[PDB]
């Protein structure tokens, strides 16, 4: 009768019951670690960064990769950019610059009940474009829970609509940049490998197809969240001025931070694609040496040096490592170690030639079902796990049926970020679920209607303006047969 | 005038960056740019102008900007097999502090040995160096240190001088774990690389084995240990009150109570990890590596650390209507030093940059035109160059570079090719100044008791003692052993 107490002790031993690997050679040994980590990632029977250290344990014990080969995959070029942007987000949050450019988009728009939760949507949609959406949901949500605390002192539907609009617009602003969330970053890191002579994916070629795709989302989702819930005021227009004059003039530590933000954003836009010759032609002797991560490290290391107050820098190391997520680094490294182990074992050739019967359907239905299943699966598991487990599976599916790899991997890396419904493994509707509002069914009913319009504009996006961009009907010389 | 004095570590960084800028732009070669990258970074911790994990991120910034190695390759040097061992062995260290396993081993050691400062820093050195001749150096320094820090903290807390006695126990463990690894072949990774290179370069020799390495390296290491103890203990701190400090320890040990369930499991796993570390490949007996002798060198000591360190996240500790594990992982993220993983990775990246650019070959091949010298002087030049080069690169990378440079040099000048290779292998392990050169030097740097000037000032004397004892041994008691004065028959005649 005591089995329900120690519940994920007796469940975590499925090291024993699926063990049909003493019968097969090498690829079932790699498809044993793939099932175990997926079972521990879906149900979350472990702290979710402990399972990422499991490919560093049994892949040397099976004889697939050496232990110094697995350890090299735990720190890729994503981690330098992750250090560089969290060096900026520490100084944005510490010197209260996020409150400066969130109470400014409100009071510029009106305080009407239709336009207030459009400025609330567009503040975090511009904040999450550069930082991570887990960071920007932790900054905007404490502000707007205090603004509506004031607007009722000058009911329940308005506060819950504001609670879900931030958590939706944070994941809406998670795309339009590779650096906006971890999903597009690990997709770009997986795309730099496995397709070496392909030169089509950069920061300029990412903003072009994704900024029309997620601004129509923001304007078609606000109508859906307004229709579902909502259909004297000079004092409430003054109660926002109550805080914007409580904060004094703009300080030196905020001018330096926004200047270093604008300078960091003007780079990544001037190592351009074919439109403009950029500063990457200054280093013409070495084409792929200085990446987007060396820009983040050049700017983010200036926060440890520039004086702020008596000296003491803008940020210190003790308040930096108290801000950086050291779980996401280990989790992404463990995903890359398992993705690199399915290649050195021959599993992602067996999945590629066992799914060649699937290339008899039309090519749009394949990406439709591979986006629908990754959208239905990501509502219960973590988002850097659902796209982790599927990218070494969908990629040999493209190379075997003569379909472009960006034809399949692009609508599958954006639809996996459409996590609007169950708050069991989601950040932004995790942070917003820490308050005592926003019941479960009211999130699901507002989330499936925005998931429909999220999938529909991606399905009309890849059929109108991306097929003349990445040449997705004319399967290239790279990734051969 | 005081504005120059208060902002002195802002003007110093931007002064020493711009004053050395003619060196990579007048000299356009990659050795000059890598020497600029080395001299700028190594000055930034020796003066300690920036935090040490911020200066370690500078190889990830200017090595792609000079054109030495791409960002995808310089990012793959910030995580090696040391980091899996560091992740695994700290899960044990997180759990022995939470359930107070230390202050039960510590308070029992204190009230069975006594409060004596000079004779406690000899028992900490003679036990670390005896444990390090069977285990790894990094594996030894990670186990003795959380117990010894608790021992001296319980000795300090029984006062009812303390800051300077905390650097002693860091340095005398981080140095003894290194000195004790010279006595055996398998005790460190420099001796194994040298023994596998010497046997494939010079067959028909049959000389280097267990017992033959012990009878020239243990009397050398014992004198280095006995003199480093006197040097370190003089450098820092050269019975009515006493028996009252023996009652505080007794009354603090009795208020622990009986040993609980959560201490027994971590005590058992501490023994199991040290038993699996010893029996992997002890050399004289085949270990459990023979079970995997079709994938050789695949499972290292980091696999053993991970396999037992991830068992703390699973084993139940307290009921709730769930259970609770032993470590809960949020107590792990606060306990784990994340500044040391970047400091060791930035040191690995510099060592890879000096190999990719060609500065290490440039330094090594300037030893070739020194053939027209007496034989004891080329030994002293090569051993000094090796001790200088091991302070910025790792020890398995320095001996790998310097063996194919010193081994043909010894055969051209009609010298036995063990008279040159033995003192250059033992001097490769003498990494004592910086915490980026030796991985045991970074374990004791994870506790915050030291500056790096205290490391440099104390490891400068141990380096001189170690070079002098090696040069004493290369002329006495080793000369009759390996016959280092006649040109042998397993060496080529021409």
Residue numbers in the entry:
A (entry chain B): 8 to 161, 233 to 309, 325 to 403, 418 to 588
B (entry chain A): 4 to 163, 232 to 309, 323 to 404, 416 to 589
Reported in the publication:
The solute carrier 13 (SLC13) family comprises electrogenic sodium ion–coupled anion cotransporters, segregating into sodium ion–sulfate cotransporters (NaSs) and sodium ion–di- and–tricarboxylate cotransporters (NaDCs). NaS1 and NaDC1 regulate sulfate homeostasis and oxidative metabolism, respectively.
For clarity, we have designated the NaS1 conformations as “IN/IN” for the inward-facing state, “IN/OUT” for the combined inward-facing/outward-facing states within a dimer, and “OUT/OUT” for the outward-facing conformation of NaDC1. Furthermore, the NaS1_IN/OUT conformations imply that each protomer within the dimer can independently execute the substrate transport cycle within SLC13 members. This analysis reveals a dual-layered transition involving both horizontal and vertical displacements. Notably, the N and C halves within a given subunit undergo a remarkable conformational interchange, a dynamic interplay that mirrors the broader conformational shift of NaS1 during the transport cycle.
